[model samples]
Target: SCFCVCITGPQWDYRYGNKEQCKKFLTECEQKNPGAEVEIQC
Candidate 1:
């Protein structure tokens, strides 16, 4: 399993079964927050 952590004004964790899903979530987080810091952990 993997997770995507995003930090904007607050922190959020999005869990997924694979790195690809985590990466997709990370990209969306970046686009949504614009200035967010996001990473994937497995």
Candidate 2:
């Protein structure tokens, strides 16, 4: 079997599911969009 994953934050995050990846993503997101933020709401 084959599977695929989609890590999307739309306008908030750059990754999803994997906490480690998400941590890196959130860091990058913050770096790119300083002074503003968005948290998980799902």
Candidate 3:
């Protein structure tokens, strides 16, 4: 399952019910926009 969204400020987050979820989203967002600053909150 792939789910990603951008909410508030220059941040986008993804939670695939796991740890890698956020990282995956960060990478994915980068594909759409160059130099997308994203952070993963465990």
Candidate 4:
């Protein structure tokens, strides 16, 4: 039941795994989105 979801603009990405993976994915999303709005749900 641990997962991560990131949303930026009209696009989104997600990863289903441990907390570390989710947090790492969140960082990646932030980098890809730059100044765009980015959020993560874990």
Candidate 5:
């Protein structure tokens, strides 16, 4: 649920909102709708 800082690099690595929530969100997606798909950018 996290992207490598390499996405931004140098001065400031990319930043994301929540790591824990990220996991929770993915889990929920899986549970609520099996075979669910995701394609998010941040």
Candidate 6:
């Protein structure tokens, strides 16, 4: 299993990270989007 980034919107984006990488990726996405919904499933 891996971390899944599920952004729900017209400008949506998805990414899969193995293990703790999700936290870092999620942070980046949030930074880019300011207030984005980040779904992380590890």
What are the lDDT scores of the predictions, listed in order? 0.77, 0.47, 0.56, 0.69, 0.45, 0.71
Across 1-42, the per-residue lDDT of candidate 5 in tens digits comes to 453221112333332446765556556555655555443343
lDDT of 6 by residue, 1-42 (tens): 566573646667777767677777787887887777778886
Best by TM-score: 1
Query: Residue 1 CA error for candidate 1 (Å)?
Result: 1.8
**Order of quality (TM-score):** 1, 6, 4, 2, 5, 3
Cα lDDT tens digits for candidate 1, 1-42? 896777877566556659888888888887888888777889
Give the C-alpha miss distance for residue 36 in model 2, angstroms: 2.9
lDDT of 1: 0.77
Q: Is candidate 2 or candidate 6 better by TM-score?
A: 6
Candidate number that wins on TM-score, 1 or 5: 1
Taking the tens digit of each residue's C-alpha lDDT, what string does model 3 give over 1-42?
Answer: 444454435554545545567666666677876655455555
lDDT of 2 by residue, 1-42 (tens): 222222334543334455666555556656766654445422
Q: Which parts of model 1 are misplaced by more than 4 Å?
A: none
The reply for model 6, stretches above 4 Å from the true place, is 6-8
Cα deviation of 27, candidate 4, in Å = 0.7
Top lDDT: which candidate number? 1
Clashes of each: 0, 0, 0, 0, 0, 0
Candidate 6 structure, TM-score to reference: 0.63
Candidate 2 regions with alpha-carbon error over 4 angstroms: 1-14
Looking at model 5, which ten-residue stretch has the lowest summed lDDT?
4-13
TM-score of the candidate numbered 1?
0.66
What is candidate 6's CA lDDT for residue 35? 70
Query: Which digits, one per residue and each the tens of the lDDT, describe model 4 over residues 1-42?
Result: 467777765776767877787778778877877754544455
